Design a protein around this ligand. Structure first.
Ligand SMILES: *C(=O)CSCCNC(=O)CCNC(=O)[C@H](O)C(C)(C)COP(=O)(O)OP(=O)(O)OC[C@H]1O[C@@H](n2cnc3c(N)ncnc32)[C@H](O)[C@@H]1OP(=O)(O)O
Lengths: 4, 665, 179, 45
């Protein structure tokens, strides 16, 4: 999963 | 002439966000020429760019009075409107600005966007035709005009615009050109939507053969062949898709139809499935699907072999993957018997591990918790035996809590779900379950602190702010219903209003993509989005919170930078039925087939003294369930009111009411 | 559960699935941007036999993979990136994430000529790490310290798609013979 | 080409809660027959  | 250059330094100071440097400048023009419209408008922008929204509008409006033929004054007026999200009033003003300054590419660009955003199709077509006339060397502008025609319902003209472009090409684009590839498929879908399946297949095979979107070509080919009753070929096509994705139900349906195999022939069907199961050992579908039409011993035998695989693997999601079969009583009882059978046959693998035994006990726990085969006492026993075997198992405790829930012990259910959470503190799913269960037990402040374990830490306004930001509708709705249950009308309404605003955002989200999709060239997706957006609020995610609001306003009617953060102004309304209308309108317009909405509408309109709309709701609800207890009650309640207030209503209303009332009580 | 290509109308329930299962969340608009930029790369798992409570029930999304092509190629070399992947806890260990990943990867190669695919995963995420390393063949490239909002490190993992590309070209040649 | 009675337009506005534009359009759709238009409008899909 990609952060922020 | 010094003012002339001074006017320019007002725009420069504006485009540099230097308000003071620009205002002080503009004020020097207005002291000498106080009725200079262009300057007043420029000042109106800066005012709006610093919250002076009401004042900016008064000023802009005054400006275009002074100079009604200035395209700047009208442009500004539009910009303000577009900023305040009134796209419709924006369109009127952009449109006139463009009639004053037809050379303005910016004005035409922004208007066109606004027009499609509000589904002004005729307007959008005119705009794109114009833009295309101005810049016809650019392919986007041809595609855009085709899209406008397409969305307008003029499929023939949209196909014409697409083909006209293709015919200008001197050289065939390379198959690497994704824009050209997407443009071919878009035209193909247009031919089929015109209903010419024969021609679309022809165009598919001839022009679209090597398009980059491989799945699209493959699915269109199978779809067309099947509709043309070209079965041998459709068979081959569905096989191609199955080999690509053995997990997609409809490809099996397609194949099986194409082979002319009757649904009665169980064994002939399984052969197809067994074939792909052999070819693709990791496909769950190729093993599981045959349990839909298999029956008797054929079912038991296949079902045992499937259950053994899953239990041996220890899979806890086995029940969830099979519960769809429980519509058939036989398959229901047989599945439980097989689990019990496996349980008895189980020996500890890995003796020198017991996951199989846990998995069967867990299956049985869920079986008897399921409403179709519910036996909460037995379910409890099975989950406890499972938890004996595996005490740190999150899913085991999760199911246990759910049994308590069904037993009605909400307290016990929240305590147990939270314990389950504490066993996997890294997993948000179980965290979300615990919070939900706590809200179900009306512990809002606790539930919010649970969610705080996963919301960004130093967010201002705490977890609630972050969850609002991230558009979390399940929690917002649950939180509202809980607050309502505690009697907190203010926070309940605030939550429901927040879900309403999330839907406004979703509707506004499509805005930048009218342009963006033309740059990507991915046109079919764009048209998919638009069509989904046209029915946005039919989603149960809107409907639930909205029906809550309407019910809570009804209750309030019978029981007399962010402003209003706790919705205290909401609760303090003098016109609740008026406040309910924006929720209700979407309900009735996008979910008319939903009786709960119709029943709620009826209650709102009789109170509003609008007996014609009341009847409309009633006739809808009754068309859905003639003998629904509420529609019968409201039918009888209406007739009394009608006989009572009929002297007061106009004769035409009186006529329509009594006439369409006799139809169905 | 059924596996199929993402639909724009699926986006609220995809977003909801992300909210339930992952600490990394996004605006709906960001889902749109994937769906409208690379409509061929994102897939969903659907509980299709879930009985409908209402005439307007949407497809019940129990899993998804959200994928993109990297707009900035490393050396002018096209490669995919997995933005987000999750399966409802109730539906894990049915092979769903594996199927979703292989569908996305195939379209990345076919449509965009992807040379590899990459992603980030929490270092403590055993379940995910075994999927990518052991089942799918991702190698680990580096550790990004405090990548995630709560400070947790991530592995940046990468899958070489050379094998898939040649495998694809081999099946392309057999069709060209038939052609 | 259908002409409409202003009292009819005001009646539909008040009793159907429609904009003057939509009320008129609905009336024009039924040849200015208000009783026909109102009956049509309250019929379900
Ligand atoms: C950013 O997006 C990259 S990392 C974000 C990962 N998502 C996430 O953490 C959300 C919560 N977890 C999940 O949603 C879910 O557990 C996944 C997506 C990580 C895995 O989903 P699946 O359950 O559907 O995976 P499967 O396809 O069924 O299994 C494939 C391989 O995965 C291994 N696996 C799966 N669950 C495991 C557990 N609990 N423990 C160890 N290993 C696990 C298996 O090796 C499986 O391969 P097999 O050969 O064994 O079948």
């Amino acid at each position: 999963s990609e952060s922020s | 002439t010094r003012e002339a250059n001074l006017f320019r330094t007002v725009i420069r100071h504006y485009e540099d966000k230097q308000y003071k440097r620009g205002l002080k400048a503009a004020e020097q023009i207005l002291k000498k020429n106080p009725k200079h419209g262009d300057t007043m408008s420029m000042k109106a922008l800066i005012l709006n760019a610093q919250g002076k929204t009401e004042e900016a509008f008064a000023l802009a409006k005054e400006a275009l009075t002074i100079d009604m033929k200035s395209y700047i004054c009208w442009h500004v007026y539009g910009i303000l409107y577009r900023t305040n999200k009134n796209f419709d009033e924006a369109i009127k003003a952009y449109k006139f600005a463009l009639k004053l300054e037809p050379e303005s590419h910016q004005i035409q660009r922004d208007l066109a966007v606004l027009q499609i955003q509000m589904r002004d199709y005729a307007g959008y077509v005119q705009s794109r035709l114009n833009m295309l006339k101005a810049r016809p060397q650019i392919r986007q502008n041809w595609t855009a005009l085709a899209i406008a025609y397409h969305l307008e319902g003029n499929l023939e003209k949209a196909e014409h615009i697409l083909t006209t472009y293709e015919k200008s090409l001197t050289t065939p684009p390379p198959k690497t050109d994704l824009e050209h590839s997407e443009a071919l498929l878009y035209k193909n879908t247009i031919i089929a939507e015109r209903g010419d399946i024969e021609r679309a297949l022809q165009h598919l095979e001839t022009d679209c053969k090597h398009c980059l979107d491989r799945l699209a070509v493959m699915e269109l080919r199978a779809s067309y062949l099947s509709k043309l009753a070209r079965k041998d070929e459709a068979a081959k096509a569905y096989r191609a898709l199955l080999d690509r994705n053995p997990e997609h139900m409809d490809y099996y349906k397609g194949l099986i139809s194409a082979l002319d195999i009757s649904a009665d022939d169980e064994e002939a069907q399984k052969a197809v499935y067994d074939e792909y199961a052999a070819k693709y050992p990791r496909s769950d579908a190729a093993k599981r699907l045959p349990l839909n039409f298999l029956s008797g011993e054929r079912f038991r035998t296949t079902a045992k072999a499937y259950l053994t695989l899953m239990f041996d693997k220890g899979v806890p999601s086995t029940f969830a993957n099979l519960k769809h079969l429980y519509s058939d009583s036989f398959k229901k009882e047989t599945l439980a018997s097989l689990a019990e059978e496996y349980l008895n046959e189980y020996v500890n693998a890995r003796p020198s591990g017991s996951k199989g035994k846990g998995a069967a006990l867990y299956y049985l726990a869920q079986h008897y918790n399921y409403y179709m085969s519910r036996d909460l006492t037995r379910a409890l026993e099975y989950v406890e035996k499972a938890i004996e075997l595996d005490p740190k198992n999150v899913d085991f405790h999760m199911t246990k809590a759910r049994i308590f829930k069904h037993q009605g012990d909400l307290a016990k259910a929240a305590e147990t779900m939270d314990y389950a959470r504490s066993l996997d503190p890294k997993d948000r799913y179980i965290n979300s379950k615990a919070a939900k269960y706590q809200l179900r037990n009306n512990e809002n402040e606790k539930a919010l602190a649970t969610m705080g374990l996963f919301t960004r830490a130093e967010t201002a306004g705490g977890p609630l702010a972050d969850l609002t930001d991230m558009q979390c509708i399940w929690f917002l709705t649950e939180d509202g219903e809980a607050w309502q249950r505690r009697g907190n009308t203010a926070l309940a309404l605030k939550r429901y209003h927040t879900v309403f605003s999330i839907f406004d955002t979703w509707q506004e989200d499509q805005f930048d993509f009218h342009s963006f999709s033309l740059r990507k060239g991915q046109i079919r997706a764009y048209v998919d989005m638009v069509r989904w957006e046209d029915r946005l609020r039919e989603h149960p995610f809107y409907f639930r919170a909205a029906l809550d609001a309407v019910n809570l306003y009804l209750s309030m009617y019978d029981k007399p930078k962010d402003d209003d953060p706790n919705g205290e102004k909401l609760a303090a309304t003098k016109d609740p039925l008026g406040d309910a209308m924006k929720f209700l309108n979407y309900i009735l317009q996008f979910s008319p087939k939903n009786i709960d909405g119709q029943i709620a509408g009826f209650e709102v309109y009789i109170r509003k003294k609008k007996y014609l709309l009341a009847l409309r709701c009633l006739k809808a609800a009754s068309a859905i369930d003639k003998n629904h207890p509420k529609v019968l009650e409201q039918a009888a309640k209406l007739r009394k009111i009608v006989s009572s207030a009929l002297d007061s209503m106009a004769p035409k209303l009186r006529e329509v009411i009594q006439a369409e009332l006799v139809g169905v009580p | 559960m059924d596996i199929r290509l993402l639909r724009p109308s699926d986006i609220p329930l995809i977003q909801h699935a992300n909210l339930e299962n992952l600490p990394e969340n996004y605006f709906l608009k960001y889902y749109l941007y994937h769906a409208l930029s690379w409509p061929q790369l994102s897939f969903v798992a659907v509980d299709v036999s879930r009985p409908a409570k209402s005439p307007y029930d949407y497809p019940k999304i129990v899993g998804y993979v959200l994928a993109k092509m990297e707009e900035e190629p490393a050396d002018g070399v096209p490669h995919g990136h997995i933005t987000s992947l999750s399966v409802m806890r109730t539906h894990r260990r049915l092979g769903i994430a594996e199927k979703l990943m292989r569908q996305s990867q195939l379209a990345m190669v076919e449509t965009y000529n992807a040379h590899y695919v990459s992603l980030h995963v929490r270092v403590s995420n055993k379940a995910a790490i075994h999927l990518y390393r052991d089942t799918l063949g991702f190698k680990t490239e580096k550790v990004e310290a405090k990548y995630y909002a709560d400070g947790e490190d991530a592995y940046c993992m990468k899958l070489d798609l050379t094998a898939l590309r040649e495998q694809i070209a081999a099946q392309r040649e057999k069709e060209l013979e038939e052609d | 080409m259908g002409k409409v009675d202003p009292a009819d337009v005001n009646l539909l506005v008040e009793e159907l809660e429609l904009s003057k534009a939509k009320a008129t359009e609905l009336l024009k759709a039924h040849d200015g027959d208000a009783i026909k238009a109102m009956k049509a409008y309250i019929q379900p899909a």
